[PDB]
Design a binder for this molecule. Structure first.
Ligand SMILES: Cn1cnc2ncn(Cc3nc([C@@H]4CO[C@@H](c5ccc(F)cc5)C4)no3)c(=O)c21
Lengths: 40, 270, 43, 40
């Protein structure tokens, strides 16, 4: 099977790295809109 | 409570307010539910500004429920900037032992933090065995920490890191046999240092290469490369030259005298 | 085809096993005389 | 192909673990700057 097993492994990792990059945009949106007082 | 939270999460302005309010040192050294203290909480999560502020306020290098130091937590997490703050301020801290005989160097090595090993090893840390008679170099090898052991091999202290082991242990053997057993590409690196080239000029008839056998001797290393199936170490120039040296040293003359003793009956009969 | 599969290790294993057997039999003074901790070669 | 099908998957996993390391350092930046009131 390995000639197509590792082919699906590629795609599960490719859509995992897409989700991790969508999430890195939201964490920057937090720091950008976050109210900073006291800890300046 | 409030300072353990503020120190644990790097909240430097909350610390400055907590310590100006609580100007006595009794709050600055309080004991957590697991026996830690603000200086440990800051070093554990890696906040260089807070661990520095607590030391500027005169916190003390007290020890955990498990006897770990702030430097042991800093090393366990690989936070080399917090270690640099500690190693600058109190160099006498660097060799303290936990409840199990580990140092901070044994923690940095076990967890794979090569640049933390480099920092403690270059700050003259005491290389030693813990209660399981294991070196920091053993803890790196037994956990496959390739970048830690390349740092230890490339170190200005490598031959000191090699001589400090328990000769009486079958579990923590001669470090060269432990590299062949667990991390053979680090042994390829170590044997590349045994080839010295004397021209950089392969077209010159006078060009030579020298092989040094100091890691193959105390045939223990080659028996170990055979017993671990390390075929790409057997096929290395230093190993091919060590065996061809051993054959030209005595083994050819040993075989030719057995064959010559047999030929003295064989040939006269035909 | 299985001797020729394992051959590359087996040949070095045979040499290592020969030399270790001889070194266990020979006397320590002869080994200290005749062993040689480094060698130069001219390609 | 598996002598290289697995090799690129190593590098994609290496750039994924690098992105997760960069993102873990922004979550700590939030807690460090966050206005904690009414929870302490
Ligand atoms: C260092 N060296 C450099 N030339 C050398 N010649 C001899 N010897 C001793 C010696 N040779 C051997 C034979 C070599 O081929 C082996 C073989 C090959 C493939 C297999 F599948 C099985 C067995 C067996 N057994 O012992 C040296 O040590 C030496």
């Amino acid at each position: 099977s390995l000639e197509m097993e590792i082919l699906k492994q590629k795609y599960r990792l490719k859509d995992l790295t897409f989700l991790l990059e969508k999430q890195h945009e939201l964490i920057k949106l937090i720091i950008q809109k976050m109210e900073i007082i006291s800890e300046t | 409570s409030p300072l353990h939270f503020a120190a644990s999460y790097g909240r430097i302005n909350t610390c400055q307010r907590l310590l100006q309010d609580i100007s006595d040192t009794r709050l600055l050294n309080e004991g957590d539910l697991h026996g830690m203290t603000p200086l440990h909480l800051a070093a554990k999560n890696g906040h260089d500004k807070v661990v520095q502020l607590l030391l500027k306020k005169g916190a003390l290098f007290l020890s955990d429920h498990n006897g770990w130091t702030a430097l042991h937590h800093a090393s366990m997490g690989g936070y080399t900037q917090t270690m640099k703050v500690i190693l600058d301020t109190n160099l006498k801290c660097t060799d303290r032992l936990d409840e199990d005989g580990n140092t901070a160097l044994h923690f940095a090595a076990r967890e794979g933090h090569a640049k933390a090993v480099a920092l403690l090893l270059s700050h003259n840390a005491d290389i030693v065995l813990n209660k399981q008679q294991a070196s920091f170099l053993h803890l790196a090898l037994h956990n496959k920490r390739k970048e830690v052991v390349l740092t230890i091999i490339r170190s200005k202290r490598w031959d000191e890191c090699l001589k400090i082991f328990s000769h009486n242990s079958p579990g923590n053997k001669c470090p060269i046999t432990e590299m062949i057993e667990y991390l053979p590409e680090c042994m390829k690196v170590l044997l590349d240092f045994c080839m010295l080239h004397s021209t950089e000029d392969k077209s010159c008839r006078d060009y030579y290469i020298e092989y040094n056998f100091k890691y193959l001797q105390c045939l223990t290393a080659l028996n170990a490369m055979v017993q671990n199936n390390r075929i790409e170490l057997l096929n290395h120039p230093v190993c091919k030259e060590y065996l061809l040296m051993k054959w030209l040293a005595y083994g050819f003359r040993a075989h030719m005298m057995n064959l010559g003793s047999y030929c003295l009956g064989l040939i006269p009969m035909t | 085809a299985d001797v020729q599969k394992h051959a590359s290790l087996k040949r070095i294993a045979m040499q290592v096993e020969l030399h270790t057997s001889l070194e266990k039999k020979l006397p320590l003074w002869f080994l200290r005389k005749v062993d040689q901790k480094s060698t130069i070669v001219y390609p």
